[PDB]
Design an enzyme around this catalytic site. Structure first.
Site, PDB file in Angstrom:
ATOM      1  CE1 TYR A  55      -2.714  -3.228   2.111  1.00 56.39           C
ATOM      2  CE2 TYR A  55      -4.045  -2.057   0.494  1.00 56.39           C
ATOM      3  CZ  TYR A  55      -3.844  -3.146   1.320  1.00 56.39           C
ATOM      4  OH  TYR A  55      -4.778  -4.155   1.346  1.00 56.39           O
ATOM      5  N   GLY A  56       2.132   1.223   0.209  1.00 57.97           N
ATOM      6  CA  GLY A  56       2.890   2.447   0.403  1.00 57.97           C
ATOM      7  C   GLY A  56       3.119   3.242  -0.856  1.00 57.97           C
ATOM      8  CG  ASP A  57       4.995   1.920  -4.353  1.00 58.49           C
ATOM      9  OD1 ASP A  57       5.651   2.082  -3.295  1.00 58.49           O
ATOM     10  OD2 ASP A  57       5.468   1.340  -5.351  1.00 58.49           O
TER      11      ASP A  57
ATOM     12  CE1 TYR B 266       7.680  -4.951   4.551  1.00 64.34           C
ATOM     13  CE2 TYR B 266       5.553  -5.242   3.495  1.00 64.34           C
ATOM     14  CZ  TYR B 266       6.663  -4.470   3.741  1.00 64.34           C
ATOM     15  OH  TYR B 266       6.752  -3.215   3.169  1.00 64.34           O
TER      16      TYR B 266
ATOM     17  CB  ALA C 293      -8.960   6.543   7.152  1.00 59.64           C
TER      18      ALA C 293
ATOM     19  CD  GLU D  91       9.173   5.644   0.356  1.00 58.89           C
ATOM     20  OE1 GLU D  91       8.488   6.349  -0.411  1.00 58.89           O
ATOM     21  OE2 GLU D  91      10.236   5.089   0.026  1.00 58.89           O
TER      22      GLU D  91
HETATM   23  C1  LIG Z   1      -1.907  -0.339   9.076  1.00 58.71           C
HETATM   24  C2  LIG Z   1      -2.470   0.770   8.124  1.00 58.71           C
HETATM   25  C3  LIG Z   1      -1.667   1.352   7.155  1.00 58.71           C
HETATM   26  N1  LIG Z   1      -2.186   2.316   6.354  1.00 58.71           N
HETATM   27  C4  LIG Z   1      -1.440   2.913   5.368  1.00 58.71           C
HETATM   28  C5  LIG Z   1      -0.122   3.603   5.847  1.00 58.71           C
HETATM   29  C6  LIG Z   1       0.568   3.678   4.800  1.00 58.71           C
HETATM   30  O1  LIG Z   1       0.249   4.857   3.958  1.00 58.71           O
HETATM   31  C7  LIG Z   1       0.177   2.327   3.944  1.00 58.71           C
HETATM   32  C8  LIG Z   1       1.305   1.299   4.080  1.00 58.71           C
HETATM   33  O2  LIG Z   1       2.390   1.792   3.259  1.00 58.71           O
HETATM   34  P1  LIG Z   1       3.910   1.568   3.802  1.00 58.71           P
HETATM   35  O3  LIG Z   1       3.952   1.972   5.238  1.00 58.71           O
HETATM   36  O4  LIG Z   1       4.907   2.335   2.956  1.00 58.71           O
HETATM   37  O5  LIG Z   1       4.272  -0.041   3.655  1.00 58.71           O
HETATM   38  P2  LIG Z   1       3.774  -1.084   2.470  1.00 58.71           P
HETATM   39  O6  LIG Z   1       4.183  -0.538   1.116  1.00 58.71           O
HETATM   40  O7  LIG Z   1       4.468  -2.409   2.757  1.00 58.71           O
HETATM   41  O8  LIG Z   1       2.286  -1.304   2.505  1.00 58.71           O
HETATM   42  O9  LIG Z   1      -0.907   1.857   4.439  1.00 58.71           O
HETATM   43  C9  LIG Z   1      -3.474   2.699   6.486  1.00 58.71           C
HETATM   44  O10 LIG Z   1      -3.930   3.565   5.754  1.00 58.71           O
HETATM   45  N2  LIG Z   1      -4.272   2.109   7.457  1.00 58.71           N
HETATM   46  C10 LIG Z   1      -3.770   1.170   8.260  1.00 58.71           C
HETATM   47  O11 LIG Z   1      -4.476   0.662   9.104  1.00 58.71           O
END
Ligand SMILES: Cc1cn([C@H]2C[C@H](O)[C@@H](COP(=O)(O)OP(=O)(O)O)O2)c(=O)[nH]c1=O
Length: 383
Positions: A17-19, A195, A256, A275
């Site tokens: 989700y980080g990208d 992970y 969120a 990230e």
């Molecule tokens: C745990 C969690 C993460 N997030 C978001 C935070 C970050 O923007 C994203 C995770 O991105 P990131 O922290 O970069 O790690 P990855 O690429 O392995 O997913 O998900 C939420 O929006 N809600 C949540 O409950």
């Protein structure tokens, strides 16, 4: 009147989700704080719907927080190009979009947004132009923890809001209650976002066997099957609570992005990954544990060098040992025992780290400034 530039941000969601998390954070800040016109192109709308529940994943175009979020089509539907085009994490622009960028009377400023690194060498490459075959140049934009770099994403007023939240017991208790969480007196609060990690059961056993109690909050995700295996439960569902001596485990919903900040702000230690959450945990001004998914070692060691430079030797050594074992799949015992007794001092140092990073101009501000100077230079004007 107000100056407004347009921005195209291209995001290809490969895994996790980080990208989309980082490009959405950036997109929102360009629109909300700088009044820019922003189009965010996403090739996987389901990922975006996860971090932004307001979103309609089936819509091809929608406006959220002033950002025009658009589906990245296959095949690509041709559109005019913005004043600035950000290619996030080398996702490769549509051919017709590169044509549109070059046909403009003022060709689009073309940026490549890079992954974050504490490695010293990114300073030599930040803002580097690279002439392309079509005759446009692109510019590499390297976020970073020191100068020269493109800085870190940080919203206006973020640390002031975080400080007020952490100073208010009622604000924290109210937020946690909205997740079904009630802290117990003297219970350390730990968030777990990671992970798959073979080092986890050894750490869970140490939390179980400790003198002081812990509450481990696990947003739904990858690691939950590992936790369920350690708990010896077939199913782990949102809202479930399990107690193993000194350790209480509670499953949270995937919330969120802004609510995840508030969770990080509540916790005494945040295990994060990737990230975006990595940086949000630092703005939380709290101890953190970082999981990078396995040439990851260079980024890990470079960050540890910088982050540990200001810590006492004994805290630095235990922190480094624990983080390395956390990312190597085991060997956490001696590290965690020594690290846990130093959490109060680590917390003071985490606050100082956040305050010092907070004095640096934030990444969105640097991006907007990059366009301004590039535009003035393009027309041979003074600055
Ligand atoms: C745990 C969690 C993460 N997030 C978001 C935070 C970050 O923007 C994203 C995770 O991105 P990131 O922290 O970069 O790690 P990855 O690429 O392995 O997913 O998900 C939420 O929006 N809600 C949540 O409950």
């Amino acid at each position: 009147f107000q100056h407004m530039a347009s921005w195209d941000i291209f995001c290809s969601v490969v895994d996790n989700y980080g990208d989309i998390g980082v490009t959405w954070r950036l997109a929102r800040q360009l629109a909300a704080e700088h009044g820019q016109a922003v189009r965010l192109w996403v090739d996987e709308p389901q990922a975006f719907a996860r971090i932004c529940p307001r979103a309609d994943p089936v819509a091809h175009v929608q406006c959220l927080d002033g950002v025009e979020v658009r589906a990245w089509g296959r095949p690509w539907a041709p559109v005019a190009a913005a004043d600035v085009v950000i290619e996030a994490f080398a996702c490769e622009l549509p051919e017709a979009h590169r044509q549109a960028m070059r046909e403009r009377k003022r060709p689009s400023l073309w940026l490549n947004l890079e992954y974050l690194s504490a490695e010293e060498w990114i300073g030599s490459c930040h803002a580097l132009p690279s002439l392309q075959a079509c005759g446009l140049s692109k510019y590499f934009f390297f976020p970073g923890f020191r100068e020269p770099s493109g800085g870190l994403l940080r919203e206006a007023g973020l640390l002031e809001r975080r400080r007020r939240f952490q100073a208010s017991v009622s604000a924290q208790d109210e937020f946690l209650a909205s997740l079904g969480v009630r802290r117990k007196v003297g219970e350390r609060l730990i968030s777990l976002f990671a992970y798959e990690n073979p080092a986890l059961p050894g750490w869970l056993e140490q939390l179980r066997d400790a003198r002081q109690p812990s509450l481990l909050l696990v947003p739904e995700g990858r690691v939950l099957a590992d936790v369920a295996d350690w708990l010896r439960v077939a199913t782990l569902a949102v809202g479930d609570v399990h107690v193993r001596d000194a350790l209480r485990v509670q499953v949270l919903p995937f919330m969120a992005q802004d609510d995840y900040d508030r969770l990080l702000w509540c916790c005494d230690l945040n295990a994060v990954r990737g990230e975006d959450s990595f940086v949000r945990a630092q703005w939380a001004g709290r101890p953190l544990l970082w999981h990078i998914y396995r040439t990851h070692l260079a980024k890990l060691e470079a960050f540890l060098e910088l982050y540990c430079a200001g810590l006492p030797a004994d805290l630095a050594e235990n922190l480094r040992t624990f983080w390395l074992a956390w990312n190597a799949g085991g060997g956490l015992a001696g590290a965690w025992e020594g690290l846990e007794r130093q959490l109060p001092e680590w917390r003071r140092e985490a606050q100082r780290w956040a305050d010092e990073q907070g004095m640096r101009p934030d990444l969105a501000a640097r991006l907007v400034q990059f366009y301004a100077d590039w535009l003035l230079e393009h027309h041979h004007h003074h600055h």
